[PDB]
Design a protein around this ligand. Structure first.
Ligand SMILES: Oc1ccc(F)cc1O
Ligand SMILES: Oc1ccc(F)cc1O
Ligand SMILES: Oc1ccc(F)cc1O
Ligand SMILES: Oc1ccc(F)cc1O
Ligand SMILES: Oc1ccc(F)cc1O
Ligand SMILES: Oc1ccc(F)cc1O
Ligand SMILES: Oc1ccc(F)cc1O
Ligand SMILES: Oc1ccc(F)cc1O
Ligand SMILES: Oc1ccc(F)cc1O
Ligand SMILES: Oc1ccc(F)cc1O
Ligand SMILES: Oc1ccc(F)cc1O
Ligand SMILES: Oc1ccc(F)cc1O
Ligand SMILES: Oc1ccc(F)cc1O
Ligand SMILES: Oc1ccc(F)cc1O
Ligand SMILES: Oc1ccc(F)cc1O
Ligand SMILES: Oc1ccc(F)cc1O
Ligand SMILES: Oc1ccc(F)cc1O
Ligand SMILES: [Cl-]
Ligand SMILES: [Fe+3]
Ligand SMILES: [Fe+3]
Ligand SMILES: [Fe+3]
Ligand SMILES: [Fe+3]
Lengths: 237, 200, 237, 200, 236, 200, 200
C-alpha cells in the first residue's frame, strides 16, 4: 500500500486561475465565497493512484484509429506529444494523461453539444496514455476546430484539447487545456483569461514541432506539462 | 528568492468532461477498461456502503455536469494505489452527476482510520476533488460520517476549521438506499451552507 | 466593344515574387532566363473581359452548399470576405473573384493529389462571385488544412485559399493565395518566401474578423485585394 | 516620392489550379456555365481556326499542368468584353494542357488588326497569359501568325524585340488538324528557343 | 543486421552553405542546377558504418608524435577537444572523427600544394579518433597557419582544421572546418562566407579553452560538433 | 515553433581532402589500417563486380580531386555496419579519382534487394556521397544497374524522380574490364545529363 | 484581428436624468411635444392595458429615480417605428418611477406575436431598457404576460434562460387597477428574485 514519503510544493493560486472570474459567466455561481481552508499534507494528500496496471487498448492514444467506422477522420492530422515533469525538472514516469476534444469543425461527440456543425463518423475525441519511463507521452489526432458558446453574444473558444494528468498524488492531479501556437482567438477567450498572468497563459500554448512531424503524413505539436514539485520530507516532528 | 518552474495552470474541465473521463455518461461507447464508481468487489473486506449526493450552485440550483474524483483508505486504513479493475478494492474512483436528477453515486467500503503526519488519528474520511464547467480549478473537500461523532470531534483536520458550524458541512448523513447502508453528502459550492473546501 | 480609355500603373516586380526562387524547386526550370520585354499599353492590354453577364448559380459563392451530397462539410465554418480596390483606393465593382482550396484535412478534390488524407463527400473546394457595386465580395467555406508536398523532405503549405481576380483589364488579372492570421507555417514556406519583402507577405494574410462572424454558426476572415491603379490617359500623342 | 497602395503580390497558381479554373480537367463536375476554350459559335464572323500547343520547361520537358488565358480581337478587330456564353464571339477564353499529351487547344477566329496607342496597326495577334505550378507570376506573351509575314514585319510591338531571332518565337505555324485550318504555338519557358515574354 | 530503427531530423539547407556560392569560384561549375530530389528515409539512409573495431595506432590522435622523423614539429602546441552530440543534445559515442590540416606555416603535406612555405619534417597533418562513451574526442596538434589560394587575387584561408564525422548513419555524415577564435581572416574568406547566416559561421569557431591547457606545455581549443537529431519512428 | 540545436554547418572537403581521408593519393605514407575501396575479399558470397567511373563539372571537364563514400547491402540484402578489415565483406568504402585520368574504382559484390520503410522492394543500389573542392555540402546519389531493368522500373525511389530521362542518369552500364564483370557510373554535377542528387 | 472604431462608452444617466428625458418629473416646464408613457390613444386596435411596477435595489429598497424606455409590437405583431404624437399607437415610450411611491405606469395595448430571426414565434413581450443613477450601462429585460402561459413555455428567448426559476422573473402578473385590466412587473436589480437581464 501507499506510504507518505514526500511533500508537494504549495500551489500558487495567483498563477492558476482564481475561482471568481465573471467574464466567464458560469464561474459566478460556481465559485466559493469563503476562503479555502489550508491544511498540512498527510498521507491522504501525498498519495494517489498509479495506473501502471490499467488495461490500455492498442489504439487508446491514437484518435485516428480508435473510433474506426469505415474510414479516417477528416481534418488536420497531428501528433501531440510532450514531457510531464515536476517543478524541480524531474520527469514524472508512468503517469496517466487523458485528453478529450471536438472534431475538425468544433463539434463534440456528446449528447449535450447543440452546435450544429456535423459529427465525423470516424472521430470520437478521447485518448489516454501513460508517460514512459522518461516522462514522455504521445497522442495522434486531428486538430480540433474553434467553437461558439453561449457566454457573451459572439464568443468562440480557440481550438483546444482538454487534458487531465494524475501525477504521483491527489495533490498533483490537474485538469487543463492545450491551445495552439498563433491562434488569434486565444487573447479573446474569457476562459483563457480566467488566468490573470499572461505568462501563465503562454504555458498552455502548444508549439509547432516540425522535428516530430511525419513527412507526407502528419504535423506535430509539443506540449510539456509541469506538476507540483515533489521533495522528501525533512526535519519533521 | 528561489523560483522553481511554474506549474501548468488549471482550466475548467468544461461541460463535455464526460467524453474524456465519464464516457458512458456522454452518451458514448466505453473502452474495455474504465475508471469508475465501484471501488469494492462484493467480497472486499469491511462495511459495504453507498455514497450519494447532489451538487448545488450559489443560486441553489443543481450542477448537473459535475465530475468527482475520490481517494480513500480501505477498511484496514491502507491506501491501495496500484489501480487495477481486478483488485478487491481500489482506493481511487470517479463518479459524475446524472443530468436528470443531478445525483452521483459511489459504491465502496467505510474507510479505516489513518494518522496525520504528526501521528494523530484522523476521523474516517473520503478525499474528494470536484470538477465542472465553471470551476476553473478543482475544489478539494472531505466526506466524514455522522456515525463517527467521537472521532470527528478529535480530528486534527476538522479542528483546523475555525467554526463548528462550518465543520458540519463535511459530515455525511447516514440513510438507506434500496434498504442498504448509505451516506448522503451534498455539496454547496456557494452561499448558505457553503461546503468547506481545502488547500494543501 | 471595348475601348482604350485608361492606363494601369506599372507593376513592381520586386514586390511580386521573382520568377527564379530556387527554394521553391519547381520554379528553377519554369522561370525565364531572358529579360521580360517591356511594351507600351495598347487597347490589347488595357481592356479585358467583364463577367456581369456570366450565369452564376445560387450557391456558387457558398462552399458549404455547392457540393451537397447529403450533408454539411466537416471543418471550421468561415466567411471569407473583403473588398477589391485599385492602388488609388477606388473600388473595383462587378469583377470576377474565383477561389479554390483543399478540405479541412488538406486534401484537394483533384485526381493528381496523392495525399492520403480523406476526401470530404460534402466538400468540393471551388467558389466564385462577382464583387458588388462597392467592390465587396463574400464566400462561405471551411478553413482548409495545411498539407505536405514534395519540395524539401518535410515541407508543408500553410492553410491557404487560392484566389483569382480579373479586374478591369488583362493587365490587372492576378492569381494569389490567402493565408490565415497567426499560422506558424507561414514563415517556413518556400512559396510564401518566393516574395522577398516580408511587408508584401503581410498583404496575403487574412485577419480574423469577429464583426462579420455569425454567432453560434461561423467565424469570418477579411482579405482585401489591391489591383493595379487605373488612371485616365493624359498628354498622349 | 508618391507611393500608392501596394498591389497584392502574385503567387503560383499551383498544380491544382484546375479545380478552380478548369473543373472538367481536375476530374470534377462542372457548373451550369464555365469559361472555357471555344471562343466562337459556328456562325461567328471571320475565319474559323484551331489553335494548339505544348509548353516546355528549361529541361525540354512538357509542362502538363499549365493553364492559359487568352484575349483577342474578333474578326472585325473589335474586343468583345461583355462575356456571355450566348455570344457569337467571346474575345476571352481559357484552356489547359492535357495531362497525357500536354497539349492545349482553342477554337476561335483569326483576329482582325487593331491599332496601338499611337495609331500604328499591330499585326493580328492573340494575347496570352500563362499560369502553372512553379510560375510565381504569370507570363505574358503574344501569338502571331506565320501567314501574316508582311504585317508582322511592320508590327510596332514585334519591333520592340531587339533580335529578329527572338521575334520568331512568337510566330505560330500554320498546319491542319483533322483537315481544318490550325496554327501551332509552342511555348518554351526557358533555354534554347525561349519564348519572348512581355511586361506592361 | 543493421536495422532501420530511427529517423534523422531533416537538414536545414539554408543553414548549411548552398551549392552555388560564386565568390567561392570553384563552386560555380561544381554545383547542381537541378533541384535535389527529396526521398523518404529507408534502411539505406538510416544506417551506416560503425568504426569501433577499426584498428587505431597509439598516436593516431596525436599529430605531435604521429609523424616523428627525429623531433617535435615547430609551432603552437594545442589540444583540440570537444563533444559530438545530436540536435536533441544526446552524445554520439564511439563515432569516427578524422581531421587534416596544414603545418604552422600554412603548408600541406600533399603533392598538389605549390605554396612555397616549407614542410616541417616532423609534421604530417592527419589525425583520427573515436569519441568515447560520453561523446568526447581530443587531438593534440600544432595550430595551422593561414594560407593563400588562387580564388581572388589576394585571398587567404583563415587558420583551419578540416574535420570529418561519421555519426550513426550515412544521413549524419559531415565534413566541415574548424576556425580559431579571433582570427581576423574569418570574415574575409569566401569559403567561410559560403555559409549565408553569420550565426552558423559562429558554430565553426573554436574557442580558446584555458581550463584544458597544460601549463608550460600546450594551449587548448574547444570545438563541439552537432549532428542531425535522431528520434525513434512513431505512428508509421 | 520548436527549435532544436542547429546542426554544425558543412564546408567543402577542399583540394587536399586526401591527406585526411585518402592518404596514398596525397603522396603520403599510410597507417596500418585504412578505409578504402575493396569492400569484398575474394571469398565473400555474391557476384563479384568492379565499379568504375568519372566525375564531370558543368563545363564537361573531369573533377580530378573527387572523393566518394559508398554504402551498400551485401549479396543477401543486409547492411553490415560492423566495419573491420578482417571481414569478408564491408558495406562501407571510400574511393577517389586519380589526378591524371580522373577515374575511381571500387571492388565489391552486387547488392541484394532491400525494402523501403513501407515494405516495398527497392532495386539493387549503391548509396554514394560525393565530396570535392568546390562542393560545399556533399551530394547524395544512387548507383543502380542496367541489368536490373524490371526491378528498376518498380523502384519506389527511382519512381520519385518525376522524369524518366532523369532516372536514366542513375543507371550504371555493364561492361567487362580485363575479363571481370564491371559497371561504369559517370556522374555529371551540372548541365547536360546532370546526375540526380537526393535530399533525405 | 480586424478592429472597428470603438463604440462611445456608456455612463450612468445619473440622478437628474429627468431634466433631459422626463421634464415634468424634474419639476420643470415641458415643451410642446414630449415622448412619454401613453403608447395608445383610446381608439387604437387591441386589448388596452395598464402596466405598472416598482424597481428594487440589492438591499430590497425602492429605486425612486429609475427611467424606463419601452419598445413593443402593436396588437397585430408589427413594430411601428414612425414616432408621432398624432398616431393612434406608438411602439416606443418612456416612463419613470415617482419619487414618493416609486411606481411607474404605462398605457398601451397587449402586443401581438412576432417571430424571431429563425421564424419561431416569440411569446407576447415588451422590450424594456432600465436607466438610473448607479447603473453604468442600461439593463435590458423583457416583460411577458402570465395569461400567455402556453406561448411563454414555447418562447425561444425565454428558453435561453437555463433555469425555469429565473424565467419566472420576466412574467408580469395580471390584476385590475380601478376597473381596467393591468399587469404588474417589478424589477429586482440584485439579489433574491433578481430579474433576468439580457445582452444582445
Ligand atoms: O467572497 C469573495 C468575494 C470576492 C472574491 F474575489 C472572493 C471571495 O471569496
Ligand atoms: O499546522 C498546520 C496547519 C495548517 C496548515 F496549512 C499547515 C500546517 O502545518
Ligand atoms: O510538512 C509540509 C512540508 C511542505 C509542504 F508543502 C506541506 C507540508 O505539510
Ligand atoms: O445554424 C447552423 C450552425 C452550424 C451548422 F453547422 C449548421 C447550422 O445550420
Ligand atoms: O489575463 C489575460 C491572459 C491572457 C491574455 F492574452 C490577456 C489577459 O488579460
Ligand atoms: O468538532 C466538530 C466536528 C464536526 C462537526 F460537525 C461539528 C464539530 O463541532
Ligand atoms: O538569366 C537569369 C539568371 C539569374 C536570374 F536571377 C535571372 C535571370 O533572368
Ligand atoms: O515606346 C515604348 C517602348 C517600350 C515601353 F516599355 C514603353 C514605351 O512607351
Ligand atoms: O502610355 C502609358 C502611360 C502609362 C503607363 F503605365 C503605360 C503607358 O503605355
Ligand atoms: O500515409 C498516410 C498519410 C496520410 C493519410 F491520411 C493516411 C495515410 O495512410
Ligand atoms: O521573403 C520572406 C518573406 C516572408 C518571411 F517570413 C521571410 C522571408 O524571407
Ligand atoms: O521582324 C520580324 C518579325 C517576325 C519574325 F519572325 C522575324 C522578324 O525579323
Ligand atoms: O538552377 C539554379 C539556378 C540558380 C540557383 F541559385 C540554383 C539553381 O539550381
Ligand atoms: O513519400 C515521400 C516522398 C518524398 C519525400 F521526401 C518524403 C516522403 O514521405
Ligand atoms: O518517416 C520519416 C520520418 C521523419 C523523417 F525526417 C523522415 C522520414 O522519412
Ligand atoms: O522508371 C525508370 C527507371 C530507370 C530508367 F532508366 C528509366 C525509367 O523510366
Ligand atoms: O418555460 C418557462 C417560461 C416561463 C416561466 F415562468 C417558467 C417556465 O418554466
Ligand atoms: Cl619533410
Ligand atoms: Fe471544450
Ligand atoms: Fe494549394
Ligand atoms: Fe584547407
Ligand atoms: Fe450630472
Amino acid at each position: 500500500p501507499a506510504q507518505d514519503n514526500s511533500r508537494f510544493v504549495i500551489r500558487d493560486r495567483n498563477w492558476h486561475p482564481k475561482a471568481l472570474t465573471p467574464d466567464y459567466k458560469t464561474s459566478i455561481a460556481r465559485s466559493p465565497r469563503q476562503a479555502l481552508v489550508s491544511i498540512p499534507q498527510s498521507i491522504s494528500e501525498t498519495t494517489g493512484p498509479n495506473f501502471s496496471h490499467l488495461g490500455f487498448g492498442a489504439h487508446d492514444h491514437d484518435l485516428l484509429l480508435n473510433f474506426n467506422n469505415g474510414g479516417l477522420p477528416i481534418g488536420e492530422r497531428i501528433i501531440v506529444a510532450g514531457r510531464v515533469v515536476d517543478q524541480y525538472g524531474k520527469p514524472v514516469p508512468n503517469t496517466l494523461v487523458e485528453m478529450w476534444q471536438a472534431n475538425a469543425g468544433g463539434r463534440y461527440r456528446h449528447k449535450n453539444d447543440r452546435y450544429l456543425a456535423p459529427l465525423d463518423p470516424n472521430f470520437g475525441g478521447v485518448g489516454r496514455c501513460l508517460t514512459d519511463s522518461d516522462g514522455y507521452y504521445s497522442f495522434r489526432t486531428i486538430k480540433p476546430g474553434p467553437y461558439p458558446w453561449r457566454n457573451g453574444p459572439n464568443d468562440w473558444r480557440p481550438a483546444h484539447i482538454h487534458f487531465g494528468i494524475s501525477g504521483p498524488s491527489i495533490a498533483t492531479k490537474l485538469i487543463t487545456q492545450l491551445y495552439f501556437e498563433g491562434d488569434p482567438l486565444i487573447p479573446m477567450c474569457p476562459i483563457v483569461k480566467s488566468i490573470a498572468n499572461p505568462e501563465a497563459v503562454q504555458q498552455l500554448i502548444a508549439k509547432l514541432d516540425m522535428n516530430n512531424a511525419n513527412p507526407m503524413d502528419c504535423l506535430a505539436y509539443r506540449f510539456d506539462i509541469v506538476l507540483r514539485g515533489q521533495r522528501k520530507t525533512h526535519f519533521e516532528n | 528568492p528561489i523560483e522553481l518552474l511554474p506549474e501548468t495552470p488549471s482550466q475548467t474541465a468544461g461541460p463535455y468532461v464526460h467524453i474524456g473521463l465519464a464516457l458512458e455518461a456522454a452518451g458514448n461507447p466505453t473502452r474495455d477498461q474504465e475508471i469508475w464508481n465501484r471501488l469494492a468487489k462484493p467480497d472486499a473486506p469491511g462495511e459495504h456502503i453507498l455514497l450519494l449526493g447532489q451538487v448545488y450552485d450559489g443560486n441553489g440550483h443543481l450542477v448537473r455536469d459535475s465530475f468527482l474524483e475520490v481517494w480513500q483508505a480501505d477498511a484496514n486504513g491502507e491506501y491501495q494505489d496500484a489501480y487495477n479493475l481486478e483488485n478487491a478494492f481500489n482506493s481511487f474512483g470517479r463518479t459524475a452527476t446524472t443530468f436528470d436528477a443531478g445525483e452521483w453515486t459511489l459504491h465502496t467500503v467505510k474507510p479505516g482510520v489513518v494518522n496525520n503526519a504528526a501521528g494523530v488519528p484522523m476521523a474516517p474520511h473520503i478525499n474528494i476533488s470536484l470538477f465542472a464547467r465553471g470551476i476553473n480549478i478543482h475544489l478539494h473537500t472531505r466526506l466524514y460520517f455522522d456515525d463517527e461523532a467521537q472521532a470527528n470531534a478529535k480530528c486534527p483536520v476538522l479542528n483546523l476549521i475555525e467554526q463548528p458550524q462550518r465543520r458540519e458541512t463535511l459530515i455525511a448523513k447516514r440513510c438507506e438506499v434500496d434498504g442498504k447502508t448509505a451516506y448522503r453528502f451534498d455539496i454547496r459550492i456557494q452561499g448558505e451552507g457553503e461546503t468547506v473546501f481545502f488547500d494543501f
